[PDB]
Chains A and B, each alone.
With several copies, the nearest count.
Chain A
Amino acid sequence: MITSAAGIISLLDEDEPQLKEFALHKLNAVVNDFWAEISESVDKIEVLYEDEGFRSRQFAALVASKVFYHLGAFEESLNYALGAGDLFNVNDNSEYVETIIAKCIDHYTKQCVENADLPEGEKKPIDQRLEGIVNKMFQRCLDDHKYKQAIGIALETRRLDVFEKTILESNDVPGMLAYSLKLCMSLMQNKQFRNKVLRVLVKIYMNLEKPDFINVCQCLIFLDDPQAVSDILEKLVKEDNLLMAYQICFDLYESASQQFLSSVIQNLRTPKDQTLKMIKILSGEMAIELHLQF
């Protein structure tokens, strides 16, 4: 075969930016085996990347990322893979590509989780190419007709816009909404992020063709938004739909606390028989009476 890359690595040392790029191309072709030799010479590729380059700035990044990946330093491999730019070619069944994708996803999730809690303006910038790689993975997962678990990646990365987009522009919107609500209530811990996700969920619910008022009221109970639930009830009673409101008020009494119930009742106070018996439901007279009778 070749049995030695020493000649190819030596081609790099020359001062000709036409020989250098062929050396880089052969070196990438053979990095599948000769990372051991190329590792000691990586520094030359490092400096070659750190210049104008003339296609060296392009290909040397990928070569150095590949050799560092083979070596074991993923932290340094990521920087050069990002610097590669368009030469990464996310769409290919390569183990190096898969591993760098995983490392980049983990790095992005860590960075987002870390910087989310910090102030609104005091945020350490993300790398735009790293964001682009993450979004390319998002879009590939969407294109694979794999709508689910893109929500999971979005949840981990703490970015909502993708979460909203993937959970809307997908089949089985009810099923995806149920999965998202299960995740939001069960697994995730951060209360602020949970409230943000639930706000997105209720927005999606309401903008649905047939709003799921019961799940909307559940999410609103979680958010502690008596004004919003009161407005929902007001709209639901202005429009001719009474059984919806009946069950909504029953569930509101069964779940929400006394303070929330009092606040929503006050908001409603601010035919009238419907409103009066809604107030009675929320106060719980009939709930307790029915339980005692049972």
Chain B
Amino acid sequence: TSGAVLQAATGMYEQLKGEWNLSKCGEELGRLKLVLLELNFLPTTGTKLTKQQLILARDILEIGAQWSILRKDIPSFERYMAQLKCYYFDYKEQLPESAYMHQLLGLNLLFLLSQNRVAEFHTELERLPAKDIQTNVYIKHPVSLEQYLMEGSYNKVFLAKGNIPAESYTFFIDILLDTIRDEIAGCIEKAYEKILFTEATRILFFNTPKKMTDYAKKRGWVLGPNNYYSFASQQTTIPSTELAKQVIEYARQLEMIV
């Protein structure tokens, strides 16, 4: 029973590898998920499988993540990455080292950058080994990108597009571009009284000038393109009721018998 199912799972895994190493992937991955559910994803402290087929389960989950990113399907990427993080971090001792791991860890870090979840990004970094952040390239590149972004060298983070350790770090750079433009827009929001169109185009990297209205058609801080755009100028009364509330509270605390 168990061994035969394991052999069948291995066979269908190798069939998937031969297939791609799109749709056919999709349904093959679904079938693999069902088969592994007849098996167990996580031994969860008391089954103690120690399976080369558990290593294989991790592998098929990885190929699922790659297929998801190839499809540009963020929710599927999130699901696969959550489960892959579980596999990577939980059973470190029993499982052997996965050489094809740091690429995906850095991919998830870059995705976190793109989604602008800096807190989760830094928690993931803290989970990661300290040495790897410097020794490796796959993790170091997202780390360097976040370092540039949080230092404020937007030109540097843009220039760092080229150095992609692997092709997988693609379209996450584009979501990161969108996030970078949003952050620049936030800087223009909280600062830069009275900004102009040409300098805004130069700084907040828009598309072709004929599309320069972008982010004014969507973010639209009631810009009012008064030639200069005026930044729409975006940015004395006694709160007697609140103050009376506070003073009555003082009187209450003074007059209560306790």
Contacts and interface: CB of A to CB of B under 8 A. Distances in A.
Direct contact of A and B (CB under 8 A): yes
Interface of A: 1-4, 6-11, 13-14, 16, 18-19, 22, 26, 29-30
Nearest to B79: A10
B42 interface: yes
A3 B89 contact: yes
Interface stretch (B3-11, B64-72, B80-88, B153-161): B80-88
A13 B75 contact: yes
CB-CB nearest 10 A-B residue pairs: A7-B83, A7-B86, A6-B82, A10-B82, A10-B79, A7-B82, A1-B45, A2-B90, A22-B37, A3-B90
Contact of A6 (B30, B34, B41, B85): B85
B89 A4 contact: yes
Contact of B44 (A2, A9, A11, A13): A2
> Which of A7, A9, A13: most chain B Cβ within 10 A?
A7
B62 interface: no
A20 to B, nearest CB: 10
B48 to A, nearest CB: 12
Given A1-B45, A3-B90, A7-B85, 8 more contacts: A3-B86, A3-B89, A4-B86, A6-B85, A7-B82, A10-B83, A22-B37, A26-B42
Nearest to A21: B37
A2 B79 contact: no
B102 interface: no
Contacts of B28: none
Contacts of B42: 2, 7-8, 26
B45 A19 contact: no
B78 interface: yes
Nearest to A9: B82
Given A3-B90, A19-B37, A26 B44 contact: yes
Interface of B: 30, 33-34, 37, 41-42, 44-45, 75, 78-79, 82-83, 85-86, 89-90
Secondary structure at chain A's binding surface: helix, strand, loop or mixed?
Answer: helix
A9 to B, nearest CB: 8
A29 B44 contact: yes
Given A14-B79, A19-B34, A22-B37, A6 B44 contact: no
Contacts of A4: 85-86, 89-90
B37 A30 contact: no
B34 A18 contact: yes
29 contacts: A1-B45, A1-B90, A2-B44, A2-B45, A3-B86, A3-B89, A3-B90, A4-B85, A4-B86, A6-B82, A6-B85, A6-B86, A7-B41, A7-B82, A7-B83, A7-B85, A9-B82, A10-B83, A11-B83, A13-B75, A14-B79, A16-B30, A16-B33, A16-B34, A18-B34, A18-B37, A19-B34, A19-B37, A22-B41
Contacts of A10: 78-79, 82-83
B86 A19 contact: no
Contacts of A14: 79
Nearest to B30: A16
Contacts of A26: 41-42, 44
Contacts of B75: 13
Contacts of A7: 41-42, 82-83, 85-86
B203 to A, nearest CB: 38
B10 to A, nearest CB: 21
A40 to B, nearest CB: 13
A2 B33 contact: no
A1 to B, nearest CB: 5
B46 to A, nearest CB: 9
A13 B79 contact: yes
B119 to A, nearest CB: 14
Contacts of B34: 16, 18-19
Contacts of B33: 16, 19
B34 to A, nearest CB: 6
B29 to A, nearest CB: 12
A18 to B, nearest CB: 6
Nearest to A1: B45
Contacts of B44: 2, 26, 29-30
Contacts of B30: 16
Contacts of B89: 3-4
Contacts of A18: 34, 37
B61 to A, nearest CB: 9
Contacts of A2: 42, 44-45, 86, 90
Nearest to B78: A10
Contacts of A22: 37, 41
Contacts of A9: 82
Contacts of B90: 1-4
Nearest to A26: B44
Contacts of A29: 44
B77 to A, nearest CB: 11
Nearest to B83: A7
